[PDB]
Design an enzyme around this catalytic site. Structure first.
Site, PDB file in Angstrom:
ATOM      1  N   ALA A   1      -0.554   9.675   0.231  1.00 43.22           N
ATOM      2  CA  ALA A   1      -0.137  10.967  -0.348  1.00 43.22           C
ATOM      3  C   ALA A   1       1.360  11.148  -0.115  1.00 43.22           C
ATOM      4  O   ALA A   1       2.009  11.706  -0.995  1.00 43.22           O
ATOM      5  CB  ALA A   1      -0.928  12.096   0.259  1.00 43.22           C
ATOM      6  N   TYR A   2       1.884  10.703   1.030  1.00 40.98           N
ATOM      7  CA  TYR A   2       3.263  11.043   1.459  1.00 40.98           C
ATOM      8  C   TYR A   2       3.898   9.853   2.197  1.00 40.98           C
ATOM      9  O   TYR A   2       4.638  10.057   3.182  1.00 40.98           O
ATOM     10  CB  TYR A   2       3.212  12.370   2.232  1.00 40.98           C
ATOM     11  CG  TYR A   2       2.560  12.346   3.596  1.00 40.98           C
ATOM     12  CD1 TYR A   2       1.200  12.574   3.765  1.00 40.98           C
ATOM     13  CD2 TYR A   2       3.321  12.154   4.741  1.00 40.98           C
ATOM     14  CE1 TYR A   2       0.621  12.567   5.026  1.00 40.98           C
ATOM     15  CE2 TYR A   2       2.751  12.124   6.004  1.00 40.98           C
ATOM     16  CZ  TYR A   2       1.398  12.342   6.148  1.00 40.98           C
ATOM     17  OH  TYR A   2       0.886  12.328   7.411  1.00 40.98           O
ATOM     18  N   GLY A   3       3.686   8.626   1.706  1.00 45.75           N
ATOM     19  CA  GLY A   3       4.341   7.431   2.291  1.00 45.75           C
ATOM     20  C   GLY A   3       4.009   6.146   1.556  1.00 45.75           C
ATOM     21  O   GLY A   3       3.005   6.150   0.805  1.00 45.75           O
ATOM     22  N   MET A   4       4.833   5.102   1.764  1.00 47.22           N
ATOM     23  CA  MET A   4       4.634   3.729   1.216  1.00 47.22           C
ATOM     24  C   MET A   4       4.681   2.699   2.350  1.00 47.22           C
ATOM     25  O   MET A   4       5.404   2.935   3.366  1.00 47.22           O
ATOM     26  CB  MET A   4       5.707   3.373   0.189  1.00 47.22           C
ATOM     27  CG  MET A   4       5.414   2.088  -0.590  1.00 47.22           C
ATOM     28  SD  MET A   4       6.531   1.861  -1.995  1.00 47.22           S
ATOM     29  CE  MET A   4       5.789   3.020  -3.142  1.00 47.22           C
TER      30      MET A   4
ATOM     31  N   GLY B   1       0.821  -1.221   0.000  1.00 46.14           N
ATOM     32  CA  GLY B   1       0.000   0.000   0.000  1.00 46.14           C
ATOM     33  C   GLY B   1       0.843   1.254   0.000  1.00 46.14           C
ATOM     34  O   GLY B   1       2.078   1.147   0.174  1.00 46.14           O
TER      35      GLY B   1
ATOM     36  N   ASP C   1     -10.406   9.034  10.383  1.00 41.23           N
ATOM     37  CA  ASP C   1     -10.259   8.469   9.018  1.00 41.23           C
ATOM     38  C   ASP C   1     -10.646   6.990   9.015  1.00 41.23           C
ATOM     39  O   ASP C   1     -10.047   6.257   8.225  1.00 41.23           O
ATOM     40  CB  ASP C   1      -8.845   8.683   8.476  1.00 41.23           C
ATOM     41  CG  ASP C   1      -8.633   8.389   6.987  1.00 41.23           C
ATOM     42  OD1 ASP C   1      -9.622   8.406   6.220  1.00 41.23           O
ATOM     43  OD2 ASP C   1      -7.449   8.164   6.592  1.00 41.23           O
TER      44      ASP C   1
HETATM   45  N1  LIG Z   1       0.385  -3.492   9.696  1.00 38.04           N
HETATM   46  C1  LIG Z   1      -0.109  -3.723   8.477  1.00 38.04           C
HETATM   47  N2  LIG Z   1      -0.354  -4.994   8.069  1.00 38.04           N
HETATM   48  C2  LIG Z   1      -0.869  -5.189   6.853  1.00 38.04           C
HETATM   49  N3  LIG Z   1      -1.180  -4.297   5.924  1.00 38.04           N
HETATM   50  C3  LIG Z   1      -0.952  -3.051   6.363  1.00 38.04           C
HETATM   51  C4  LIG Z   1      -0.431  -2.696   7.588  1.00 38.04           C
HETATM   52  N4  LIG Z   1      -0.346  -1.319   7.711  1.00 38.04           N
HETATM   53  C5  LIG Z   1      -0.824  -0.863   6.571  1.00 38.04           C
HETATM   54  N5  LIG Z   1      -1.214  -1.870   5.709  1.00 38.04           N
HETATM   55  C6  LIG Z   1      -1.777  -1.691   4.364  1.00 38.04           C
HETATM   56  O1  LIG Z   1      -1.241  -0.476   3.874  1.00 38.04           O
HETATM   57  C7  LIG Z   1      -2.313   0.383   3.399  1.00 38.04           C
HETATM   58  C8  LIG Z   1      -1.897   1.818   3.572  1.00 38.04           C
HETATM   59  O2  LIG Z   1      -1.422   1.953   4.928  1.00 38.04           O
HETATM   60  P1  LIG Z   1      -1.877   3.225   5.782  1.00 38.04           P
HETATM   61  O3  LIG Z   1      -1.226   3.144   7.143  1.00 38.04           O
HETATM   62  O4  LIG Z   1      -3.363   3.388   5.745  1.00 38.04           O
HETATM   63  O5  LIG Z   1      -1.301   4.382   4.812  1.00 38.04           O
HETATM   64  P2  LIG Z   1      -1.515   5.944   4.415  1.00 38.04           P
HETATM   65  O6  LIG Z   1      -0.192   6.272   3.765  1.00 38.04           O
HETATM   66  O7  LIG Z   1      -1.924   6.700   5.660  1.00 38.04           O
HETATM   67  N6  LIG Z   1      -2.683   6.021   3.228  1.00 38.04           N
HETATM   68  P3  LIG Z   1      -4.215   6.586   3.402  1.00 38.04           P
HETATM   69  O8  LIG Z   1      -5.051   5.741   4.349  1.00 38.04           O
HETATM   70  O9  LIG Z   1      -4.817   6.749   2.023  1.00 38.04           O
HETATM   71  O10 LIG Z   1      -4.210   7.837   4.216  1.00 38.04           O
HETATM   72  C9  LIG Z   1      -3.511  -0.061   4.241  1.00 38.04           C
HETATM   73  O11 LIG Z   1      -4.735   0.454   3.719  1.00 38.04           O
HETATM   74  C10 LIG Z   1      -3.302  -1.582   4.229  1.00 38.04           C
HETATM   75  O12 LIG Z   1      -3.802  -2.108   3.017  1.00 38.04           O
HETATM   76 MG   LIG Z   2      -3.374   8.474   6.409  1.00 35.48          MG
END
Ligand SMILES: Nc1ncnc2c1ncn2[C@@H]1O[C@H](COP(=O)(O)OP(=O)(O)NP(=O)(O)O)[C@@H](O)[C@H]1O
Ligand SMILES: [Mg+2]
Length: 349
Positions: free
Chosen positions: A26-29, A23, A140
């Site tokens: 906007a500002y991370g992977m 996943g 969120d």
């Molecule tokens: N601990 C984890 N185990 C498994 N999958 C994970 C985990 N953390 C994150 N993911 C996956 O990674 C995606 C993005 O992580 P997330 O922490 O929501 O990122 P973000 O950069 O804040 N994106 P957004 O929700 O659009 O604001 C999630 O929606 C899951 O599909």
């Molecule tokens: Mg977020």
């Protein structure tokens, strides 16, 4: 060389290896990885927030809140990686337990049994009770921020929008506008845009419950202002009682201006759904923030009666006060505080 994933470098080696894309935002992977020290699978969330003050402010909250939480339905920070000096720190890597999937992904391939829907919803609110007990708004909640395991263990993640609102201060006028993912925004985010409360989370859970019922976002607004239409499209026009409660005159008048819309019975949208589930869905998706059901009463609802047990639903022993809200500061000062927060994870200390 540091391993790369889709041309984003992930400087977490040598401890964490075999990275896979899971996943982004906007500002991370985020990658799946292997902890060569603990011989376990993990997830690493690369955050690259230092160029903007908003990203810095959210990164600091996400770390500070997640570091002080401990709950079976809230993802933990196992480890944080960053450079040994602040000038050299350009990213921050948040190592968490690897969960197998998230609700968004699960809902593309599975029609969930009533039992699963019920048990997931039970876990969402179990978590949300801890979160709210701590004076945090998540802000969120959506299927993609809910993690799942084949054991049907659930965990709320992405505290990237979360924040403390000490109930000993009136936050009316001080809260960030334009929060949550569009389809999961409570109507008062649009109408009381700086004056909302933690009930905006209970709204998000309604949208998640709906989405679990029909594999479809109930309120798929094509843009910001279309979102309020999709809502009233189902809920009907607010009651006269509901309008009077909207203190904002500008927003009350806009509503008064809109054509009358009729209520769509929940039966018509969820004809094969449990009636109890539709009842809770009704109390969670209430237009009035003040008449909308609270996390405790939601768990107590009949739908979740097989799971509700206040003896086994922990709350935060030290709920967070105004001190943990002092982040209205330049990005250079927030980077310093992020450096200080993540230091306990460093060879040194
Ligand atoms: N601990 C984890 N185990 C498994 N999958 C994970 C985990 N953390 C994150 N993911 C996956 O990674 C995606 C993005 O992580 P997330 O922490 O929501 O990122 P973000 O950069 O804040 N994106 P957004 O929700 O659009 O604001 C999630 O929606 C899951 O599909
Ligand atoms: Mg977020």
């Amino acid at each position: 060389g540091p391993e790369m994933v889709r041309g984003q470098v992930f400087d977490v080696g040598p401890r964490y290896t075999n990275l896979s894309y899971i996943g982004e935002g906007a500002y991370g992977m985020v990658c799946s990885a292997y902890d060569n020290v603990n011989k376990v699978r993990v997830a690493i969330k690369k955050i690259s927030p230092f160029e903007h003050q908003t990203y810095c402010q959210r990164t600091l909250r996400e770390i500070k809140i997640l570091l002080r939480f401990r709950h079976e339905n809230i993802i933990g920070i196992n480890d944080i990686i960053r450079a040994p000096t602040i000038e050299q720190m350009k990213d921050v890597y948040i190592v968490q337990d690897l969960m197998e999937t998230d609700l968004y992904k699960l809902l593309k391939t599975q029609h969930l049994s009533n039992d699963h829907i019920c048990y997931f919803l039970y876990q969402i609110l179990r978590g949300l009770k801890y979160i709210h007990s701590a004076n945090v708004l998540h802000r969120d909640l959506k299927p993609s921020n809910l993690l799942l395991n084949t054991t049907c263990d659930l965990k709320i993640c992405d505290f990237g929008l979360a924040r403390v609102a000490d109930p000993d201060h009136d936050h009316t006028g001080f809260l960030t506008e334009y929060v949550a993912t569009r389809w999961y925004r409570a109507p008062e985010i649009m109408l009381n845009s700086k004056g909302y409360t933690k009930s905006i989370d209970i709204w998000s859970v309604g949208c998640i419950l709906a989405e679990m019922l029909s594999n479809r976002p109930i309120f798929p607004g094509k843009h910001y202002l279309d979102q309020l239409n999709h809502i009233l499209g189902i809920l009907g026009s607010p009651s006269q009682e509901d309008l009077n409660c909207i203190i904002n005159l500008k927003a009350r008048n806009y509503l008064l201006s809109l054509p009358h819309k009729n209520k769509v019975p929940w039966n018509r949208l969820f004809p094969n759904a449990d009636s109890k589930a539709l009842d809770l869905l009704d109390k969670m998706l209430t237009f009035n923030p003040h008449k909308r059901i609270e996390v405790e009463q939601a768990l107590a609802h009949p739908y979740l009666e097989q799971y509700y047990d206040p003896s086994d639903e922990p709350i935060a022993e030290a709920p967070f006060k105004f001190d943990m809200e002092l982040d209205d500061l330049p990005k250079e000062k927030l980077k310093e505080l992020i450096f200080e927060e993540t230091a306990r994870f460093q060879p040194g200390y």
